[PDB]
RNA sequence: GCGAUGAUCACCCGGGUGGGUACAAAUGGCAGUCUGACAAGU
RNA sequence: GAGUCCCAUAACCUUUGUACCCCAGAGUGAGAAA
RNA sequence: UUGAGAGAUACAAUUUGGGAAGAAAUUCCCAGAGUGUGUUUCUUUUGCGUUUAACCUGAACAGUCUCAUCGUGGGCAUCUUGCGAUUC
């Protein structure tokens, strides 16, 4: 109903960090993606 | 699947064990496979069977 | 164990873990239609078998990896798959719709068609229609109204094929997803120019384009156009 | 830079320079050496190949100051002709000789005469490994006249291909200038190490102290490998001495 | 002939291994994704987060862009390194395949010289040697 | 109201992990289907 | 030109499913119960 | 040192949206654009000169006979030290 209180928009938005925190573990780090990107181009070509 | 196979494969279709052993160990390969039991191959004799 | 996780679009999963792949639930467990790897995971615990979706084999899967905002294909929806060469991609579409939904697979060439029929027996929710997509009037009986129209037909006059089918069997505000191969349409000019023309032709046929996505690296010179059928 | 700040280093150098003046036996001693006691074995077999330590602040010597002997691959006609003609290297070398000629002409007592006449010996890297047989023991114990490897030209060797033989005089002069100004060391599979840091009556005490710190920084810096960063695990103690004077400590851990 | 047979068998195995492995791996998409808006103003105020209704860091994930409502035990580094290993492994299969392919071609070229016919050795300025056969029909 | 016609003699938190025997299935793996223009007669 | 003749009509490994098993084995040999 | 257009990248000033944490200002994280400068890629306009250029093809290797392949002997370690490839 779009009746979120100031507190309602805080707890839900805390969950955004919580679940997004879980996903960044799967997402893998930036440094390895630098190597993975180079390997991917060589295999794809 | 058989239709798309070349004639060489059909010759040695049933002798994969001897074929791939020989290929990897640099030895002579089989020449009859499963076709050995065809009547025409039986009529031949000596080296003519391979031909 | 592999941690299969949900995806944005219902009926699609990702077998996240070590080897992460795009994945769909198997309607007919215990067998693979084209030898794809199958993953089973216990969930409270009962194992549910899952099939891998290879983007390089299916252009629709390449759309998922690209991040298409809206897919009208979803569980419990009727889908009209034009250019269903075989069960390579239709089976996964059959997985997404689930038992409640149905998939209308349309094919013309006879040799892949016999492959399609042998797959349809395993999947009850797939209705194989062996007919030319250029004349939808022939197979009008076997097809009810369809929430989405997916087209992988690689023909120069494909936009006409979508219009005739969309005018006939697509619901108002329904789905239209088209995979475009620019080489078939015009090889002299760059792919971007060809795609612009295809979007324009769809607009003339009362299809509003929503988004467009290039399929690299999965395919070269390809893109998927997603639109909505606004008859009004 | 703590070594320079420490007064212990300055007083020892003052004592060393003074007592060389006083003691007749040390009259011929001219060079200053530092003895470094590494905590752990270096583990490098002595290859007799000098390793250059860059001294940034001060230059120990210039090529014009020293007798330089150049040993070249046979035939030496190309290298001798090119070096002797080019103005930059026309007057750089006291003598240019090939390996075969050096072996034939100089033997026995003549090798001692060659040792005295020349202050620096440089040789093509291709023929460096042959010199220990030719030059004899005298050159190859003590490290005072140990030959230095130099490269005639910037050409490189590629497998299954033949190197083009060329002599680049400016490159050879550049290498020799670096060799003279920068001090050198030789690895050995033991704690002790000796490095020249100064020359009596040429370098003031502050200059010698700076050279010592440059030596320590280069030898301890792991980033400078494989030439530098050989002294792993820190330095237990450092001394100073001439050839015949004893080790005066300048640093102790 | 047997040497040609042996190397081809090795090359065929490597090709199949490469095909199986590449299927296991997942490749991130690199393609343009345009969106169409009817109004010029809707363009100027367009924001990816608003259109996808998702967090900005969540936007950049093409494979799985999860809207906020959907948002609402192994070390990661060990998982990450092992992931790099599989990607290298498929690449090593590719490098072995090309090396075997080049080796087979040189053997086949030598075998053509053994066969009957009239051939002339032609050497280019680069030094590459090739054999050109005379235009004679085979009996 | 006994007996030589035979007495006695893995792990973890009600629940989950570990090990063993037999059979069936797998479009799961090993695993990749030989060569390519001459031969025979007068 | 060339190993059918070491069952590729097969063996082995892995996954899954079904049904049973967690005492000794040339088993021991006078105790058990009170 | 012609004109215009598109893209990428480095830098400087400045700005859009989302999130947190703060009474607001404000603080942080994330995604992003246009402006000026410099570099770079491509597309084409104009001025001038110039009219052919490259490759293939006919009976186009071989008396100082040519070439292939398998062997033998020697040189190059002061280095072509030699890949189921062609070191002399």
UniProtKB/Swiss-Prot annotation, chain B:
The entry's localization annotation reads:
Nucleus, Nucleolus
> What role does this protein play?
Required for pre-18S rRNA processing. May bind microtubules.
Q: Which family does it belong to?
A: Belongs to the NOP5/NOP56 family.
Assembly and partners are described as: Interacts with SIK1/NOP56 and NOP1. Interacts with the trimethylguanosine synthase TGS1. Component of the ribosomal small subunit (SSU) processome composed of at least 40 protein subunits and snoRNA U3.
**Anything further noted?**
Present with 34700 molecules/cell in log phase SD medium.
Give the protein name, as stated in the record: Nucleolar protein 58
Query: Which span of the entire protein is present here?
Result: 308 to 358 of 511
Curated annotation (Swiss-Prot), chain C:
| Broad class of enzyme this protein falls into | transferase
In its record, the post-translational modification comment is: Methylated by HMT1, forming asymmetric dimethylarginines (DMA) within a domain referred to as an RGG box, made up of repeated Gly-Gly dipeptides interspersed with Arg and aromatic residues.
GO terms assigned for molecular function: histone H2AQ104 methyltransferase activity; O-methyltransferase activity; RNA binding; rRNA methyltransferase activity
* Gene Ontology biological-process annotations: box C/D sno(s)RNA 3'-end processing; maturation of SSU-rRNA; regulation of transcription by RNA polymerase I; rRNA 2'-O-methylation; rRNA methylation; rRNA processing; snoRNA guided rRNA 2'-O-methylation
**Where does the UniProt entry say this protein principally localizes?**
nucleus
Q: Kindly state which keywords UniProt assigns to this record, in alphabetical order.
A: Isopeptide bond, Methylation, Methyltransferase, Nucleus, Ribonucleoprotein, Ribosome biogenesis, RNA-binding, rRNA processing, S-adenosyl-L-methionine, Transferase, Ubl conjugation
Family according to the record: Belongs to the methyltransferase superfamily. Fibrillarin family.
Q: What is this protein called?
A: rRNA 2'-O-methyltransferase fibrillarin
The record lists the lineage as: Eukaryota, Fungi, Dikarya, Ascomycota, Saccharomycotina
Residues represented out of the complete protein: 85 to 323 of 327
From Swiss-Prot, chain D:
**What's any GO biological process attached to this entry?**
maturation of SSU-rRNA
The record's listing under Pfam families reads: Ribosomal_L1
Q: What would you give as a GO molecular function for this chain, any one?
A: RNA binding
Q: Which cysteine pairs are joined by S-S bonds?
A: none
- Where does it reside? Nucleus, Nucleolus
Keyword annotations of the record: Nucleus, Ribosome biogenesis, rRNA processing
What does the annotation say about its assembly with partners? Component of the 90S pre-ribosomes. Interacts with FAF1.
Protein name per its UniProtKB record: Ribosome biogenesis protein UTP30
Please name the source species: Saccharomyces cerevisiae (strain ATCC 204508 / S288c)
UniProtKB/Swiss-Prot annotation, chain E:
Q: Name one GO cellular component term.
A: sno(s)RNA-containing ribonucleoprotein complex
Region: Disordered; residue ranges are 108-139
KW Ribonucleoprotein (keyword) present: yes
**Example GO biological process term?**
endonucleolytic cleavage in ITS1 to separate SSU-rRNA from 5.8S rRNA and LSU-rRNA from tricistronic rRNA transcript (SSU-rRNA, 5.8S rRNA, LSU-rRNA)
Keyword Nucleus found = yes
User: What family is it from?
Assistant: Belongs to the UTP11 family.
Protein name, per record? U3 small nucleolar RNA-associated protein 11
Part of the full-length chain shown: 101 to 250 of 250
């Amino acid at each position: 109903e779009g009746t979120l209180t100031d507190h309602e928009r805080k707890y839900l938005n805390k969950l955004i960090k919580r679940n997004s925190q879980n996903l960044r573990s799967w997402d893998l780090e930036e440094e390895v993606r630098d190597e993975l990107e180079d390997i991917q181009q060589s295999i794809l070509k | 699947s058989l239709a798309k196979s070349p004639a060489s494969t059909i010759q040695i279709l049933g002798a994969e064990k001897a074929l791939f052993r020989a290929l990897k160990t640099k030895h002579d390969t089989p020449k009859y496979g499963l076709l050995y039991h065809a009547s025409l191959v039986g009529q031949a004799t000596g080296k003519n069977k391979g031909k | 164990k592999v941690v299969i996780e949900p995806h944005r679009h219902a009926g699609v999963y990702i077998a996240r873990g070590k080897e992460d792949l795009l994945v769909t639930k198997n309607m007919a467990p215990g067998e693979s239609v084209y030898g794809e790897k199958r993953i089973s995971v216990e969930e409270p615990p009962t194992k549910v078998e899952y099939r891998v979706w290879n983007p390089f084999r299916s252009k629709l899967a390449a759309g998922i990896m690209g991040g298409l905002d809206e897919l009208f294909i979803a569980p419990g929806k009727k889908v009209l798959y034009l250019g269903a060469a075989s069960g390579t991609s239709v089976s996964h579409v059959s997985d997404v719709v689930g038992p409640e939904g149905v998939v209308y697979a349309v094919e013309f060439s006879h040799r892949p068609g016999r492959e399609l029929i042998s797959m349809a027996k395993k999947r009850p929710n797939i209705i194989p229609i062996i007919e030319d997509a250029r004349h939808p009037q022939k197979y009008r009986m076997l097809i009810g109204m369809v929430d989405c129209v997916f087209a992988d037909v690689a023909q120069p006059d494909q936009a006409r094929i979508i219009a005739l089918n969309s005018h006939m069997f697509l619901k108002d505000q329904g789905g239209v997803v088209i995979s475009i191969k620019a080489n078939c349409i015009d090889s002299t000019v760059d792919a971007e120019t060809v795609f612009a023309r295809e979007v324009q032709k769809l607009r003339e046929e009362r299809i509003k384009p929503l988004e467009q996505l290039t399929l690299e690296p999965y395919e070269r010179d390809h893109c998927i156009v997603v639109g909505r059928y606004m008859r009004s | 830079n703590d070594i320079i700040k420490s007064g212990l280093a300055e007083k020892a150098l003052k004592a060393l320079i003074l007592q060389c003046e006083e003691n007749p036996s040390l009259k011929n001693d001219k060079d200053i050496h530092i003895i470094i006691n590494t905590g752990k074995k270096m583990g490098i077999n002595r290859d007799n190949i000098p390793r250059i330590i860059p001294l940034t602040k001060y230059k120990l010597f210039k090529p014009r100051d020293l007798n330089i002997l150049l040993i070249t691959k046979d035939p030496s006609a190309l290298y001798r002709e090119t070096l002797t003609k080019d103005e930059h290297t026309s007057e750089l070398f006291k003598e240019i000789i090939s390996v075969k000629n050096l072996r034939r002409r100089f033997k026995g007592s003549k090798l001692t005469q060659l040792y005295k006449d020349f202050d620096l010996v440089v040789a093509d890297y291709r023929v460096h490994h042959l010199l220990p047989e030719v030059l004899g023991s005298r050159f190859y114990h003590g490290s005072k006249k140990l030959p230095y490897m130099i490269r005639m030209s910037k050409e490189v060797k590629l497998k299954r291909q033949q190197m083009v033989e060329k002599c680049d005089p400016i490159y050879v002069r550049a290498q020799l200038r670096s060799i003279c100004k920068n001090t050198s060391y030789i690895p050995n599979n033991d704690n002790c190490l000796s490095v020249r840091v100064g020359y009596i009556q040429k370098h003031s005490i502050p200059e010698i102290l700076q050279n010592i710190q440059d030596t320590i920084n280069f030898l301890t810096d792991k980033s400078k490998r494989p030439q530098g960063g050989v002294i792993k695990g820190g330095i237990i103690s450092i001394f100073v001495k001439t050839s015949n004077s004893t080790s005066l400590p300048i640093y102790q851990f | 002939t047997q040497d040609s047979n042996y190397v081809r068998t090795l090359r065929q195995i490597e090709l199949k291994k490469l095909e199986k492995g590449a299927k296991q791996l997942m490749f991130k998409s690199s393609g343009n994704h345009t969106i169409f808006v009817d109004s010029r103003e809707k363009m100027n105020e367009f924001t990816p987060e608003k259109f996808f209704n998702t967090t900005s860091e969540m936007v950049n994930r093409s494979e799985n862009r999860l809207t906020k409502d959907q948002l609402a035990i192994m070390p990661k580094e060990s998982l990450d390194k092992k992931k790099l290993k599989k990607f290298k492994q498929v690449k090593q299969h590719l490098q072995r395949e090309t090396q075997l392919k080049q080796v087979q071609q040189r053997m086949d070229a030598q075998r053509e010289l053994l066969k009957k016919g009239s051939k002339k050795k032609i050497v280019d300025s680069s030094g590459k040697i090739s054999f050109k056969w005379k235009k004679q029909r085979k009996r």
